Structure formats: structure tokens, C-alpha cells
């Protein structure tokens, strides 16, 4: 249970290492809350930057403050866009969390309009609420600006351009910031040459905890060598691996592709042209003739694993073939030996 207790600490965690962002959001809600007014704040960032976690923290703190009467009471509501099949179910959620309970999306939206013509509403990943007419976004952002509406809106998504089609952004995590979170809870061990090794990344936090959690799995069955192995089992590109393990005729077919490309110089060629090249190579390697039924199988083996991008098999000799891997990568996979 020594280095095994370090397993238990990776999957979720607390408390935040985003110190400055937290304060900004707290003061935003506190400002709007103290005044008995509404507002909206859009939060950008990379998927791993601690946006929803920080918000949840700010909420728990504001509820504590609401118990001592430091800040006005009370209610809070959260809904996730990716948790719904059909965007319009949002109106049901919001209403169901408030009074009035169940109703259709049409009747709910009408009711929310009535209520809004204090409450904190978190809409996490409203990128999913995009619709042709975008009525729901227009409503969520219009509601807090009504006189009779006291509503504070916190909108999370991954892109800065969303509101362009009262704002904040979470930058990706740096060398030191990631290094911080890992040792931040290693307190079982107060092994730390690794925490900085894994810490060079782009830019998610989940990568760190999941990577190092795998490193411990390597150790048992932690040094820097264990983490290099951990990363090489994850971020390592599988394409070059597959080309090395591909069969004989599969490689000759790639050589055929590269031959046709070096002739034309384009990124597309037809199975017919590639076929002529493949015949030439099989002739020069002492191989048997590449029966077109075989070569079609091969070309599908390489298109099933996405080494190739191939037109549907119905087109027969007119298949147009693109490489899903850069020519330099293939030459390196074939020529390494």
C-alpha cells in the first residue's frame, strides 16, 4: 500500500492550483450577487485547464459565504451541453432545477422568459447548444441583461471565438504548473525526478495524472526510466510501428505509391497507376505477379488501418489513393533496416 496509495490519488483530485483565476471568478459572481443584478461570463481554454473544477470550487466557497450571510443567498444551477442528446432539453433542465418542474422545451422557454421578465447558472460546454438559428444562446445571454432578471451566467467552452459567432480565458498548463499539481498531492512521499519529466507537455492536466498513474503500473509490474516507458506507450505514433510490421507485399505497395508520387509529385494517384508500379517492384524482388484480386486486398488492409485514404472499393481501377502518413515518415519506416 506504499506506492499503491499513489494510484488512489491520481484519478480525481482537489484543491485547485489555479489561484489567480479563482479569485477573478469569485469577484465576478460576488459583484453581480452583492448588487442584486445579472450578468454573463464566457470562459475559454484547452480541455484540461481546470475550468469547471475552478468554477465548482468558487461555488462551494460562495455557498459557505452564503451561510455566514457574507453574500446574498443562494440558489445555483448547473447543466452540461454534452450530457444532452437534443440541445433543447436545456430549457427542461433549468426549469426542473427551479420550481415549475417538468414541461416541454417550448413551454419551459416561455416560462423562463416569464421568470426573467438571484440565481447562478453554470452552462458547461455550450458549444453543443449551437443550432442553425442559435435561439438558445441568444436567450441565455439575453436573459441576464433584463431589468427584472437577476441571473448570473457562467459559460464554459474550449474556443475563444464562440461568443463572436464579460469574458475570461484559461491558458494551457506550463512546465512548472503541471510539475506543481503532481507533487501537490504526492504528500504520501514528500520519486520526484519523474514529476518534472512528465511535466513537459501540451497542455492538458489529465495527461499528467493518467501518465504518471501508468508509470506506477510499470514500476510495480518510480524513476525517470519508468515514465519514459509510460509516455512511449501513449504518445508514441503507431503509424511507423505498423509500417515496420506490415507484410512483404504491403510494403512493396507503399513503395509503389512512393514511386508514383515521385513521378507525378501530387498527393493523389489511381489504384491503376499504383498497380503498375507495384508490378514493377514485385518483378524486381523475385516475387510472384501481384494478382489484382490480391492487390485489392492489400490496398484494403492498408486502408482499413488508415495508413491510406482510399476511395470506395466499387470504383475498382479508378480508386484514388492518398497517403495518411507523410512520405518522409514512410521512407523512415521502410529504410530503417
Amino acid at each position: 500500500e506504499a506506492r499503491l496509495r499513489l494510484h488512489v490519488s491520481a484519478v480525481p483530485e482537489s484543491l485547485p492550483c489555479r489561484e489567480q483565476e479563482f479569485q477573478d471568478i469569485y469577484n465576478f459572481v460576488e459583484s453581480k450577487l452583492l448588487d442584486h443584478t445579472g450578468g454573463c461570463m464566457y470562459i475559454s481554454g484547452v480541455p484540461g485547464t481546470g475550468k469547471t473544477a475552478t468554477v465548482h470550487e468558487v461555488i462551494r466557497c460562495l455557498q459557505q459565504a452564503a451561510q455566514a450571510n457574507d453574500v446574498p443567498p443562494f440558489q445555483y444551477i448547473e447543466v452540461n451541453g454534452m450530457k444532452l442528446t437534443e440541445p433543447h432539453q436545456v430549457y427542461v433542465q433549468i426549469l426542473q432545477k427551479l420550481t415549475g418542474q417538468k414541461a416541454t422545451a417550448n413551454h419551459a422557454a416561455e416560462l423562463l422568459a416569464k421568470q426573467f421578465c438571484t440565481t447562478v447558472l453554470l452552462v458547461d460546454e455550450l458549444d453543443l447548444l449551437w443550432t442553425h438559428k442559435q435561439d438558445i444562446m441568444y436567450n441565455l445571454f439575453d436573459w441576464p441583461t433584463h431589468k427584472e432578471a437577476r441571473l448570473v451566467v457562467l459559460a464554459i467552452a474550449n474556443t475563444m471565438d464562440l461568443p463572436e459567432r464579460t469574458r475570461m480565458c484559461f491558458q494551457p498548463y506550463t512546465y512548472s504548473q503541471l510539475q506543481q499539481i503532481l507533487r501537490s498531492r504526492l504528500k504520501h512521499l514528500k520519486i520526484q525526478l519523474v514529476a518534472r519529466k512528465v511535466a513537459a507537455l501540451s497542455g492538458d492536466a489529465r495527461r499528467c495524472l493518467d501518465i504518471c498513474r501508468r508509470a506506477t503500473e510499470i514500476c510495480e509490474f518510480v524513476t525517470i526510466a519508468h515514465s519514459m516507458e509510460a509516455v512511449d506507450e501513449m504518445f508514441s505514433s503507431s503509424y511507423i510501428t505498423a509500417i515496420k510490421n506490415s507484410s512483404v507485399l504491403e510494403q512493396s505497395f507503399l513503395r509503389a505509391i512512393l514511386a508514383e508520387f515521385r513521378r507525378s509529385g501530387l498527393e493523389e494517384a489511381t489504384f491503376q497507376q499504383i498497380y503498375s508500379q507495384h508490378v514493377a517492384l514485385c518483378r524486381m524482388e523475385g516475387l510472384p505477379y501481384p494478382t489484382m484480386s490480391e492487390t485489392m486486398a492489400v490496398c484494403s488492409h492498408l486502408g482499413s488501418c488508415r495508413l491510406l485514404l482510399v476511395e470506395p472499393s466499387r470504383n475498382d481501377l479508378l480508386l484514388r489513393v492518398r497517403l495518411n502518413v507523410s512520405q518522409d515518415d514512410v521512407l523512415y519506416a521502410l529504410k530503417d533496416e
Binding site: 494510484h7 484519478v11 480525481p12 484547452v46 480541455p47 484540461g48 447543466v79 452540461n80 454534452m82 450530457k83 444532452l84 442528446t85 432539453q89 427542461v92 433542465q93 426542473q96 460546454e125 453543443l128 474550449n158 492538458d204 489529465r206 495527461r207 493518467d210 501518465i211 501508468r214 503500473e217 509490474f221 506507450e233 501513449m234 504518445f235 503507431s238 503509424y239 510501428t241 505498423a242 510490421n245 506490415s246 507484410s247 512483404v248 507485399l249 491503376q272 498497380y275 516475387l287 510472384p288 494478382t291 489484382m292 484480386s293 490480391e294 486486398a297 492489400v298 488492409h301 482499413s304 488501418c305 488508415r306 495508413l307 466499387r314 470504383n315 475498382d316 481501377l317 479508378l318 495518411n324
Partner: protein, 394 residues
């Protein structure tokens, strides 16, 4: 007796749950490891088994899942859910399929929950579950990806024991996931299956044909080991190896040669496998050409002359008709001369066979390779000396 057949048929055709695991020793450790961690402890993980098709995945996960549930605590406390991208084409179908495999059909339908996640969470809360997603590629293609996102979202932040194990053949899988789902996927837990060495292939050949401990089996295995080394079986197995590097293709080869074994032919021979190999090596489109009428052939030779004259430009019936008329013109008498509607019937039959493709007033291009044509003509049973001379005119 036929007891041989009953065995190899469940091994070759159906996929034998128990067999020898070749070269997966590392990958099995990582999968079985993770599986203990989610089943025995309260940990939640997600992993992808990624290989070419026909090798690896489904047997690995099947073998791993079996050994896992042989633990008494596991069999009682662990539920497993098997999903497939072919069967469930919609995340709503999948939701109701999870509800079905979890024996949670007692919800029952009276509460339609406000959100997809709320319905999924309500199912798990009614205690680990191992989610197997086969043909993971297709689950990535569902609209906004609700099933993947919320399974990973539940795998990470919900602390409900769950195991999300995908199977895919795509080296491109990770690029098919949204930024959000890619993050929540326990990052790039990846098992790769791929291929082996030729000596390992031959050892596999002899191991799959041999019979287990079940004097009849002992005599059988001695003869297999004799086959393992032969200049014939080996030069055939290599030819298949240079294409396959796959145990499923091998299984087919062993199966076809297994029909050759009867009560009058007790055990396989070199010829049994050579014949079985010949059936697989046939060129399908060459076989189809062999059965055309001499009219259809002459049309293809007309099309051949048209691609060699106009430089691979498409053509229509008219110009084919003209070039074909130039063929019968040689003799004043009518031998191959037929009425235009009939020639077009045969022409339309070539299209009906998808030996010509469109893009008469429609332009089309020939789907045959010239070496297929000249080889077929030499192998054609009745081919008249006149059409052969015409074929080489170009």
C-alpha cells in the same frame, strides 16, 4: 472419426475461446492488469486495443474477461456490457442496450430522464461494470458523441467503477475523438497487436492443426509436425505469409484443406494444402471474363483499342460500335455482324457486371487491366483466331 473436424471447425471457423496466445504476452499483461484493477479495486480506467483486422483483439479481450470472472468475488460483484458499432448505430439504441444487458429493464420506461447522462448514471447507481465497445471506430461517428463523452466523463469524475475498453483497427482512431473526449479518454492506453516472424508463423500453422490432449490424437500430431517442414508446404505458407501475416487468413487456408480430409483421406498432405491455396489465389475479375460471349469480348477489345488510341479517355457506345464495325469490315460477308440493339444488350451486360463504369450519351471507362485481357484471351476456351489477331493489332 470425424472428431477431428468438430474440433478444428470450432477453432478455424468459429473463434475458439481457448487457444494458444501468440506474441500477445505483453499486451495481455496490460489488459488483464487493468481488468483486475477495475474489478477487484474501485478504480476506473479506459483503454483501446488497436490492431489490423483479423489479428488480436476479440480473442484477447475474451480470454482476459474469462480469467477475470473465474474469481468468485468477481463473478458475483462484476457485470459486463458488450457493445458493437454494427449492432448499435445510435447512442439511443446503445442506452437501451446497456439498460438491457444490466438487467435494469425495470426502470421501467416510466421515468424518461432529463439528460442522457442522468439516465446513464441512474443505471449504474442501481458495483462495477466493464463496458466493451467493439468497432469503436463507429461509436466515434455518432452525431455529437454522447456515449463516448459521457462514458469517459463517468469513467473519470463520477467515481463509479467502470471499465471502457474499445476495440478498433484504425491507427487514426485518436484523431476521430473530439478534443474533450480525447482528454477524458484515459490518455492513450493503447495495445497494439500487429504481426510476427515467419518461423513463428509456421509454428502457429502446426499448432492450430494439431489436437490437444483431448493414441488417435498422438498419431495425428506426429503427421502435422511432419507437414511443418516441407519444401512445398513452406513455399506455400511463405506466399500466404508475404500477404497475410495474419492468423485468420491462415485459418481459412487450413479449413479449405480440412475438407480434403475424410474417412478415405485420414490426414492432410502437401497436395491438400496446395489445392486449398489455389482456390484463394484466383483472380476474381479474370474468372468473370472467362464466361463472356464472344460478342462481349470483341467489345472489350474495341474498348482496349479505344484506350490505346484516344489515350485513356472515356468512351460511349457509338465509338465502340464504330471500332467494332471496323473489325467485321475485313470480310464482305457477315459473320460477327449483329444488330445495334443486340450489341448494346451485351454492352449493357458488361456494365451490369461492373466491368465498365460511367461518369450513347454517357461516357464510360474500362475496368480491366490489359494484362488481364491478354491473359484471358490466351485462356479462353473457344477464342477464334480472328479476335486474337485483332487483339494484337494495337
Amino acid at each position: 472419426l470425424s472428431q477431428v473436424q468438430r474440433i478444428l471447425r470450432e477453432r478455424f471457423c468459429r473463434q475458439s475461446p481457448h487457444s494458444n496466445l501468440f506474441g500477445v504476452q505483453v499486451q495481455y499483461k496490460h489488459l488483464s492488469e487493468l481488468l483486475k484493477r477495475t474489478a477487484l479495486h474501485g478504480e476506473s480506467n479506459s483503454v483501446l486495443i488497436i490492431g489490423p483486422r483479423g489479428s488480436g483483439k476479440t480473442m484477447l479481450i475474451n480470454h482476459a474477461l474469462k480469467e477475470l470472472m473465474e474469481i468468485e468475488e468477481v463473478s458475483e460483484n462484476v457485470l459486463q456490457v458488450h457493445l458493437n458499432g454494427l449492432l448499435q448505430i445510435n447512442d439511443k439504441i446503445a442506452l437501451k442496450e446497456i439498460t438491457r444487458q444490466l438487467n435494469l429493464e425495470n426502470v421501467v420506461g416510466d421515468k424518461v430522464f432529463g439528460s442522457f447522462a442522468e439516465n446513464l448514471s441512474f443505471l449504474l447507481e442501481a458495483c462495477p461494470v466493464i463496458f466493451i465497445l467493439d468497432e469503436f471506430d463507429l461509436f466515434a461517428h455518432h452525431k455529437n458523441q454522447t456515449l463516448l463523452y459521457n462514458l469517459f466523463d463517468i469513467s473519470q469524475s463520477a467515481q463509479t467503477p467502470i471499465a471502457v475498453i474499445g476495440l478498433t483497427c484504425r491507427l487514426d482512431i485518436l484523431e476521430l475523438l473530439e478534443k474533450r473526449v480525447k482528454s477524458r479518454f484515459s490518455h492513450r492506453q493503447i495495445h497494439l497487436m500487429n504481426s510476427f516472424g515467419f518461423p513463428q508463423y509456421v509454428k502457429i500453422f502446426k499448432e492450430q492443426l494439431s489436437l490437444p490432449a483431448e493414441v488417435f490424437a498422438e498419431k495425428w500430431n506426429e503427421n502435422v509436425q511432419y507437414l511443418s517442414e516441407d519444401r512445398s508446404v513452406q513455399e506455400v505458407l511463405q506466399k500466404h505469409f508475404n500477404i497475410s501475416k495474419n492468423l485468420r487468413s491462415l485459418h481459412m487456408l487450413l479449413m479449405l484443406a480440412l475438407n480434403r480430409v475424410t474417412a478415405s483421406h485420414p490426414f492432410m498432405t502437401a497436395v491438400d494444402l496446395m489445392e486449398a491455396s489455389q482456390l484463394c489465389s484466383m483472380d476474381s475479375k479474370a474468372n468473370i471474363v472467362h464466361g463472356l460471349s464472344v460478342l462481349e469480348i470483341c467489345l472489350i477489345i474495341a474498348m482496349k483499342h479505344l484506350n490505346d488510341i484516344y489515350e485513356e479517355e472515356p468512351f460511349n457506345f457509338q465509338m465502340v460500335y464504330n471500332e467494332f464495325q471496323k473489325f467485321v469490315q475485313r470480310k464482305a460477308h457477315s459473320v460477327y455482324n449483329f444488330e445495334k440493339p443486340v450489341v448494346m444488350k451485351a454492352f449493357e451486360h458488361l456494365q451490369q457486371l461492373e466491368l465498365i463504369k460511367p461518369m450513347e450519351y454517357q461516357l464510360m471507362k474500362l475496368l480491366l487491366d490489359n494484362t488481364q485481357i491478354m491473359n484471358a484471351l490466351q485462356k479462353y476456351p473457344n477464342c477464334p483466331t480472328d479476335v486474337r489477331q485483332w487483339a494484337t493489332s494495337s
